[PDB]
Design an enzyme around this catalytic site. Structure first.
Site, mmCIF file in Angstrom:
data_model
loop_
_atom_site.group_PDB
_atom_site.id
_atom_site.type_symbol
_atom_site.label_atom_id
_atom_site.label_comp_id
_atom_site.label_asym_id
_atom_site.label_seq_id
_atom_site.Cartn_x
_atom_site.Cartn_y
_atom_site.Cartn_z
ATOM 1 N N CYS A 263 1.046 -1.356 0.097
ATOM 2 C CA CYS A 263 0.151 -0.304 0.183
ATOM 3 C C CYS A 263 0.770 1.209 -0.253
ATOM 4 N N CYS B 101 -2.150 1.500 -2.704
ATOM 5 C CA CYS B 101 -2.984 2.660 -2.234
ATOM 6 C C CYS B 101 -2.489 3.923 -2.593
ATOM 7 N N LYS C 272 -0.920 5.283 -5.896
ATOM 8 C CA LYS C 272 -2.132 5.046 -6.906
ATOM 9 C C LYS C 272 -3.045 6.661 -6.778
ATOM 10 N N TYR D 234 -9.304 -4.193 -10.607
ATOM 11 C CA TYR D 234 -9.476 -2.503 -10.316
ATOM 12 C C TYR D 234 -7.773 -2.233 -10.076
ATOM 13 N N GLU E 188 -7.953 1.364 -12.497
ATOM 14 C CA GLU E 188 -7.565 2.896 -12.286
ATOM 15 C C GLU E 188 -6.083 3.148 -12.804
ATOM 16 N N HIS F 264 -28.106 19.036 2.664
ATOM 17 C CA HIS F 264 -28.401 19.805 1.391
ATOM 18 C C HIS F 264 -26.894 20.439 1.602
ATOM 19 N N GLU G 58 -26.824 12.825 0.316
ATOM 20 C CA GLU G 58 -27.993 12.497 0.289
ATOM 21 C C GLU G 58 -29.205 12.147 -0.658
HETATM 22 C C1 FAD Z 1 -2.468 -0.732 -7.657
HETATM 23 C C2 FAD Z 1 -3.483 -1.980 -5.866
HETATM 24 C C3 FAD Z 1 -3.508 -0.542 -5.701
HETATM 25 C C4 FAD Z 1 -4.821 -1.059 -4.634
HETATM 26 N N1 FAD Z 1 -5.187 0.106 -4.199
HETATM 27 C C5 FAD Z 1 -6.040 -0.110 -2.362
HETATM 28 C C6 FAD Z 1 -7.096 1.079 -1.842
HETATM 29 O O1 FAD Z 1 -6.966 2.208 -2.238
HETATM 30 N N2 FAD Z 1 -7.399 0.706 -0.910
HETATM 31 C C7 FAD Z 1 -7.244 -0.786 0.254
HETATM 32 O O2 FAD Z 1 -7.931 -0.765 1.243
HETATM 33 N N3 FAD Z 1 -6.787 -1.358 -0.673
HETATM 34 C C8 FAD Z 1 -5.688 -1.015 -2.209
HETATM 35 N N4 FAD Z 1 -4.409 -2.559 -2.401
HETATM 36 C C9 FAD Z 1 -4.622 -3.000 -1.346
HETATM 37 C C10 FAD Z 1 -3.474 -2.955 -0.659
HETATM 38 O O3 FAD Z 1 -2.551 -2.606 -1.060
HETATM 39 C C11 FAD Z 1 -3.984 -4.419 0.146
HETATM 40 O O4 FAD Z 1 -4.213 -5.110 0.771
HETATM 41 C C12 FAD Z 1 -2.373 -4.154 1.140
HETATM 42 O O5 FAD Z 1 -1.655 -3.941 1.299
HETATM 43 C C13 FAD Z 1 -1.883 -5.591 1.595
HETATM 44 O O6 FAD Z 1 -1.214 -5.921 3.011
HETATM 45 P P1 FAD Z 1 -0.819 -6.861 3.591
HETATM 46 O O7 FAD Z 1 0.513 -6.161 4.308
HETATM 47 O O8 FAD Z 1 -1.149 -8.019 4.111
HETATM 48 O O9 FAD Z 1 1.016 -7.380 3.109
HETATM 49 P P2 FAD Z 1 1.827 -6.456 1.485
HETATM 50 O O10 FAD Z 1 1.310 -5.157 2.235
HETATM 51 O O11 FAD Z 1 1.911 -7.102 0.468
HETATM 52 O O12 FAD Z 1 3.051 -6.465 2.726
HETATM 53 C C14 FAD Z 1 3.815 -7.720 2.815
HETATM 54 C C15 FAD Z 1 5.249 -7.359 2.903
HETATM 55 O O13 FAD Z 1 5.723 -8.264 3.238
HETATM 56 C C16 FAD Z 1 7.220 -8.936 2.082
HETATM 57 N N5 FAD Z 1 7.831 -9.700 1.830
HETATM 58 C C17 FAD Z 1 6.860 -10.977 1.146
HETATM 59 N N6 FAD Z 1 7.375 -12.035 1.221
HETATM 60 C C18 FAD Z 1 8.576 -11.578 2.458
HETATM 61 C C19 FAD Z 1 9.249 -13.000 2.991
HETATM 62 N N7 FAD Z 1 9.509 -13.524 2.663
HETATM 63 N N8 FAD Z 1 9.973 -12.603 3.589
HETATM 64 C C20 FAD Z 1 9.809 -10.865 4.331
HETATM 65 N N9 FAD Z 1 8.919 -10.376 3.881
HETATM 66 C C21 FAD Z 1 8.508 -10.863 2.472
HETATM 67 C C22 FAD Z 1 6.827 -7.606 0.432
HETATM 68 O O14 FAD Z 1 8.121 -7.732 0.284
HETATM 69 C C23 FAD Z 1 5.955 -7.068 1.649
HETATM 70 O O15 FAD Z 1 6.481 -5.805 1.459
HETATM 71 C C24 FAD Z 1 -4.022 -1.496 -3.449
HETATM 72 C C25 FAD Z 1 -2.817 -2.813 -4.014
HETATM 73 C C26 FAD Z 1 -2.664 -2.602 -5.412
HETATM 74 C C27 FAD Z 1 -1.590 -3.713 -5.149
HETATM 75 C C1 FAD Z 2 -27.068 32.668 2.441
HETATM 76 C C2 FAD Z 2 -28.380 30.768 3.072
HETATM 77 C C3 FAD Z 2 -27.592 29.776 2.604
HETATM 78 C C4 FAD Z 2 -28.271 28.282 3.251
HETATM 79 N N1 FAD Z 2 -27.159 27.459 2.773
HETATM 80 C C5 FAD Z 2 -27.978 26.099 3.508
HETATM 81 C C6 FAD Z 2 -27.489 24.466 3.090
HETATM 82 O O1 FAD Z 2 -26.464 24.511 2.378
HETATM 83 N N2 FAD Z 2 -28.448 23.642 3.567
HETATM 84 C C7 FAD Z 2 -29.443 23.576 4.165
HETATM 85 O O2 FAD Z 2 -30.223 22.468 3.348
HETATM 86 N N3 FAD Z 2 -29.749 24.414 3.948
HETATM 87 C C8 FAD Z 2 -29.104 26.010 3.810
HETATM 88 N N4 FAD Z 2 -29.905 27.387 3.869
HETATM 89 C C9 FAD Z 2 -31.827 27.284 5.098
HETATM 90 C C10 FAD Z 2 -33.054 27.052 3.683
HETATM 91 O O3 FAD Z 2 -32.445 27.859 2.437
HETATM 92 C C11 FAD Z 2 -34.011 26.723 4.627
HETATM 93 O O4 FAD Z 2 -33.266 26.046 5.200
HETATM 94 C C12 FAD Z 2 -34.768 26.337 3.187
HETATM 95 O O5 FAD Z 2 -34.799 27.088 2.246
HETATM 96 C C13 FAD Z 2 -36.071 26.754 4.143
HETATM 97 O O6 FAD Z 2 -37.172 26.174 3.587
HETATM 98 P P1 FAD Z 2 -38.190 27.010 4.073
HETATM 99 O O7 FAD Z 2 -39.322 26.410 2.072
HETATM 100 O O8 FAD Z 2 -38.822 26.485 4.903
HETATM 101 O O9 FAD Z 2 -38.561 28.770 3.310
HETATM 102 P P2 FAD Z 2 -38.381 29.452 1.829
HETATM 103 O O10 FAD Z 2 -37.310 28.649 1.357
HETATM 104 O O11 FAD Z 2 -38.597 30.396 2.662
HETATM 105 O O12 FAD Z 2 -39.770 29.610 1.249
HETATM 106 C C14 FAD Z 2 -40.303 30.969 1.904
HETATM 107 C C15 FAD Z 2 -41.229 31.374 0.768
HETATM 108 O O13 FAD Z 2 -42.339 32.521 0.763
HETATM 109 C C16 FAD Z 2 -42.344 33.012 0.517
HETATM 110 N N5 FAD Z 2 -43.560 33.633 1.786
HETATM 111 C C17 FAD Z 2 -43.056 34.785 2.374
HETATM 112 N N6 FAD Z 2 -44.624 35.280 2.749
HETATM 113 C C18 FAD Z 2 -44.845 34.933 2.004
HETATM 114 C C19 FAD Z 2 -47.060 35.429 1.912
HETATM 115 N N7 FAD Z 2 -46.991 36.181 2.565
HETATM 116 N N8 FAD Z 2 -47.108 34.997 1.050
HETATM 117 C C20 FAD Z 2 -46.313 34.040 0.113
HETATM 118 N N9 FAD Z 2 -45.543 33.656 -0.108
HETATM 119 C C21 FAD Z 2 -44.197 34.039 1.129
HETATM 120 C C22 FAD Z 2 -41.180 33.566 0.397
HETATM 121 O O14 FAD Z 2 -41.119 35.032 -0.401
HETATM 122 C C23 FAD Z 2 -40.622 32.814 -0.242
HETATM 123 O O15 FAD Z 2 -40.141 31.880 -1.518
HETATM 124 C C24 FAD Z 2 -29.584 28.755 3.458
HETATM 125 C C25 FAD Z 2 -30.450 30.217 4.141
HETATM 126 C C26 FAD Z 2 -29.417 31.053 3.537
HETATM 127 C C27 FAD Z 2 -30.460 32.379 3.630
#
Ligand code: FAD
Ligand code: FAD
Lengths: 584, 584
Positions: free
Chosen positions: B150, B155, B158, B290, B294, B564, B569
């Site tokens: 790894c 990993c 990669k 994989y 990748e 959101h 989500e």
């Molecule tokens: C290209 C690639 C990408 C990968 N990407 C991911 C990922 O994204 N996410 C994930 O979870 N896993 C990933 N894996 C898998 C992960 O790398 C392995 O599952 C993990 O390394 C296994 O761990 P290990 O300790 O069992 O063996 P290893 O990590 O392979 O190490 C065993 C060590 O023992 C040494 N050895 C071997 N024989 C002997 C010996 N007789 N005497 C002494 N030393 C020895 C070896 O040289 C080695 O260094 C990837 C593998 C590859 C090949």
């Molecule tokens: C800058 C900003 C960033 C935000 N970022 C997030 C986020 O990232 N994630 C998240 O989950 N929430 C976020 N929020 C909160 C989210 O926008 C509000 O929770 C959500 O829009 C509320 O929904 P609502 O239907 O209760 O009210 P509103 O969406 O405000 O709807 C009310 C509507 O009724 C209208 N209205 C008001 N009075 C009347 C009336 N008498 N008659 C008719 N129409 C009327 C209004 O003009 C409006 O259009 C953010 C809010 C702001 C201000």
């Protein structure tokens, strides 16, 4: 089983056409197949798909005196079972299913995230729905289309500008990775057009969606007069009343201005910021809410001289260790903080001019809590100090719907003190102000009203994420509120710093990103809080919110095998506690 | 009982210094304070933190006849409770704990993810540990340092090359967000030079960590002769034997070359690619693991003409709907596929040329299963057709540990058929070939051996992610095996496309990213498989693996509120099934 049946009489009476059915029953298909053939809107509920579908059949036989399903109601009038429907000829049934007493089954005041969702789901279950949305313009004149805050002046543009800020750092990373990058200047206007182009596509999209569902979208403001009728004034200015069985208040909030000379005249809010003609220039953000900090963050990385003016602490209500690491990181990459400090006045010296492309100069004064006054010049003043629920001027005085600190009070079914008036989304006093909450409250309310289900929206373990330049996602309790709720003789905090593999080649600073879990040792080491500060904090966090609804314990994180190489895997190997004092 | 009582006898006898304790007790703290001031490495297990802690305190009472804690063992010799140790005094006391029949408590053949993790946790709980690791070079002569597959050729490099590939696309995205960029050419040498510098930083880190833990690292090859001694040949050829109470095989795998003319002579493997002197030029990958895809993926985005040649299918053993969209997407952005087709021979036409660049030209021909032959020229041929476990020439014939297709077969405690020989990581027949598995297995094995703990590693629900140009993460069963295991009218599949908000402005293609959940309706709609295809797929997936250990159902994803705006989500609102036939 006494009033849980009268709660169901109640859902039956305020539904539209409603059909209690079962999945394998042949009889039910014939009546439903027929309603579809005569274009009769209906909502059905299928009890083989309910753990308690058994108790529904008990209750329905007291209401109706019939033992089997289907059982069919037209707005509370019980039509009967399968043969009672096939004895009403093809047109007296269609006529009988559309008499109502009111113009609408439901009127929704507000077309935000939650209103739109509740509208779409209600119509799919038979309801004649009117959806009102009208956008009262900003002081400087800004308005937008259908969709609510999120779509127009909230989550969608915020995150998009956040991503234009990230790509600037991504592009300096790219040289460490072997790319020769020019990276030139940032064209503010081209970005705001790309962003407003997506918004309009969502304006169009929500507006299309309402028509294809047979929701009457009316671009007009709503006011309540009595429990069953709503006053609507439209663009052109004319009043018209409409009648409804059900009222839903879904009006969201709007930004707050401080009561100081020049605030409305010369400042802007998030409502104005996502549509600015011009790069904002030398900017002052006022407040330390998520909206203030996220805006300062992407504005700084886009290229602006940004200054944030904080009355006291950052992100009141969030974990304050984490709030420290957000601000310390914002601070270490150009955003300047004046704090503690509050503005006192803003006046204009020079004025914006699209005849030259030169930004207004404003001067802002302030008090430093110690008394030292503050005075400096900015081209933009952005007020991000809080948002106020739209509960004034909607008639809640006329029906006496209770409010507390501006928010409409509501039970666990989002119902007010008047049994046919509901409130969802941000105007509620339930839950965080988040659009996925608004949308869920919408979908579940729609299915209680018009299919008689008992699904309730769950407001516990709601995840949030703050899109500051380094992101912060969290679920559950802050460390300080957990210690208060459960006692430090019951809390353990596991933590660790970590270094995204994407950061080692580019030589970004290790021991910045941070993970911590709050554990309640007295309840089988339950995970009561979850905090991550690092890249892609939103996508790290989301899945764990499912595990905490299932009651995950520390045992459960450690049994889970990490995905390598990711940031999220550090939560599968937390080892170091805080009470141990060992280094993280 | 009875069987488990002897299972604990055994870990007591093959432990080092062992102390069974409770956290209430000064009597334990005084024994261990005294070991720490006398510089005695020991391993303890604390019986209040075990749910079955009562059963340990009555099992020990069968071994020793005492009920109190602390109880202390020296490699099986029972010394006693607190006063039984407060005799002996500081020097016949230190003589008893360093007496051993062998040079080492544990010898580990292999310094990879699993070996290194297994060594460190053992030393921390009292064991005298020797760690052997020696890297026999590639045909091309390439080697690397401590860390295993790894760190050096897996990993870590990669994913770093993957991140160089992503940043190229993130940089065109950035023009839509307003940046006048633009990106020049990519320097291969600067990128691997930065990459190997981080690799070297981990080589150093793992060797420091072994020295700070007092493991004797021997950069030498290990071979078994009898259960209790290992033959070690170092750089020179000098052999030395060392004796040991417990042997662990952790030798990983190394890549396989096909049996064809010119394979080892002129091709390369993943072992070579992360250290190449030159830009690979026009490249051929053979195989569809994989690892092949990748590598094909990031080479292409960096700038190479790349081609993959598949004997049959992509990503055998994965869900093949997903495998389809992985490839369909690779193919649509520059990577060419010949399939079905297999290599026959590779010969060389021109050779390296320094430093006129002139990269070697090789010609590869093959046959298309239909018989039609293949013929063309490339500058690099990369073989990613599998990996074979290092079980030849380590002496398993000498003690007769059973293997199945080269893999050391092993029980639920990772023990072989010889009671003091264990095997962890990829030489196991246990689990997927993943680095977090090797590490967790090592890490639990260390405490069964030296804390008498009974924690076993869990190989269910392991999440994996494929870092192809668009990433693919998954947990549990593919859609095709859930139907085999459970039968098709017990599975429902919810799915949906989605459009990352970051992709809207740049106009990357909609209905490409994909999410689906496999549901087994017969067991309370349990989520038995989880698949996502999209950006940052490792960080999306990880958290949900926790939720599946808790038995997450579709109900539970639906009760969870989305964050959101994120990709993750979409798993909180999946709505359309496949049996319904509606669009995703
Ligand atoms: C290209 C690639 C990408 C990968 N990407 C991911 C990922 O994204 N996410 C994930 O979870 N896993 C990933 N894996 C898998 C992960 O790398 C392995 O599952 C993990 O390394 C296994 O761990 P290990 O300790 O069992 O063996 P290893 O990590 O392979 O190490 C065993 C060590 O023992 C040494 N050895 C071997 N024989 C002997 C010996 N007789 N005497 C002494 N030393 C020895 C070896 O040289 C080695 O260094 C990837 C593998 C590859 C090949
Ligand atoms: C800058 C900003 C960033 C935000 N970022 C997030 C986020 O990232 N994630 C998240 O989950 N929430 C976020 N929020 C909160 C989210 O926008 C509000 O929770 C959500 O829009 C509320 O929904 P609502 O239907 O209760 O009210 P509103 O969406 O405000 O709807 C009310 C509507 O009724 C209208 N209205 C008001 N009075 C009347 C009336 N008498 N008659 C008719 N129409 C009327 C209004 O003009 C409006 O259009 C953010 C809010 C702001 C201000």
């Amino acid at each position: 089983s006494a009033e849980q049946v009268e709660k169901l009489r109640n859902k039956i009476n305020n539904a539209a056409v409603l059909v209690f059915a079962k999945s394998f029953c042949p009889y039910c298909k014939k009546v439903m197949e027929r309603f579809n053939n005569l274009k009769i809107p209906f909502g059905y509920l299928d009890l083989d798909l309910k753990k308690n579908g058994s108790d529904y059949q008990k209750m329905l036989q007291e209401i109706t005196g019939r033992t089997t399903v289907p059982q069919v109601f037209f707005r509370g009038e019980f039509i009967g079972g399968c043969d009672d429907v096939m004895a009403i000829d093809d047109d007296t049934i269609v006529k009988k299913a559309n008499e109502m007493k009111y113009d609408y089954d439901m009127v929704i005041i507000g077309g935000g995230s939650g209103g739109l969702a509740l509208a779409k789901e209600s119509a799919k279950s038979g309801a004649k729905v009117a959806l009102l949305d009208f956008v009262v313009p900003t002081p400087m004149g800004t308005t937008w289309g259908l969709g609510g805050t999120c779509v127009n002046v909230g989550c969608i543009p915020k995150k998009l500008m956040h991503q234009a800020a990230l790509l600037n750092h991504y592009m300096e990373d790219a040289k460490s990775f072997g790319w020769d990058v020019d990276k030139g200047p940032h064209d503010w206007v081209k970005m705001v057009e790309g962003i407003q182009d997506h918004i309009h596509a969502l304006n169009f999209g929500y507006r299309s969606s309402m028509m294809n569902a047979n929701v009457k979208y009316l671009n007009a403001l709503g006011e309540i007069v009595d429990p069953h009728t709503i006053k609507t004034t439209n663009k052109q200015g004319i009043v018209k009343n409409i009648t409804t069985n059900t009222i839903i208040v879904a009006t969201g909030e709007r930004p707050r201005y401080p009561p100081i000379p020049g605030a409305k005249e010369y400042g802007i809010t998030s409502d104005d910021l996502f549509t600015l003609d011009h790069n904002p220039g030398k900017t002052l953000c006022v407040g330390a809410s998520y909206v203030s900090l996220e805006c300062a963050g992407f504005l700084s990385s886009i290229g602006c001289d940004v200054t944030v003016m904080v009355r006291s602490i950052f992100l009141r209500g969030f974990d304050q260790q984490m709030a420290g690491l957000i601000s310390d990181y914002i601070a270490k990459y150009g955003v300047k903080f004046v704090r503690p400090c509050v503005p006192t006045s803003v006046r204009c010296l020079e004025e914006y001019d699209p005849e030259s492309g030169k930004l207004a100069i404003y001067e802002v004064e302030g008090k430093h809590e110690d008394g030292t006054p503050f005075k400096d010049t900015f081209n933009t003043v952005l007020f991000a100090v809080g948002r106020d629920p739209c509960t004034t001027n909607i008639g809640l005085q006329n029906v006496d719907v209770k409010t507390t600190n501006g928010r409409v009070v509501v039970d666990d079914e989002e119902r007010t003190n008047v049994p046919n008036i509901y409130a969802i989304g941000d105007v509620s006093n339930a839950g965080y102000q988040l659009t996925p909450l608004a949308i869920q409250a919408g979908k579940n309310l729609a299915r209680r009203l018009y299919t008689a289900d008992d699904c309730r929206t769950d407001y516990t373990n709601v995840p949030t994420t703050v899109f500051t330049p380094l992101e912060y996602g969290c679920i559950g309790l802050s460390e300080e509120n957990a210690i208060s709720k459960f006692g430090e003789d019951n809390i353990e905090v596991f933590h660790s710093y970590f270094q995204p593999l994407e950061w080692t080649v580019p030589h970004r600073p290790d021991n910045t990103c941070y993970a911590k879990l709050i554990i309640n040792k007295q309840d089988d080491n339950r995970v009561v809080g979850f905090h991550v500060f690092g890249p892609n904090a939103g996508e790290v966090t989301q899945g764990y919110a499912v595990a905490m609804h299932l009651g995950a314990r520390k045992e459960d994180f450690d049994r889970t095998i990490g995905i390598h190489p990711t940031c999220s895997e550090t939560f599968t190997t937390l080892r170091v506690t805080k009470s141990s004092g060992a280094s993280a």
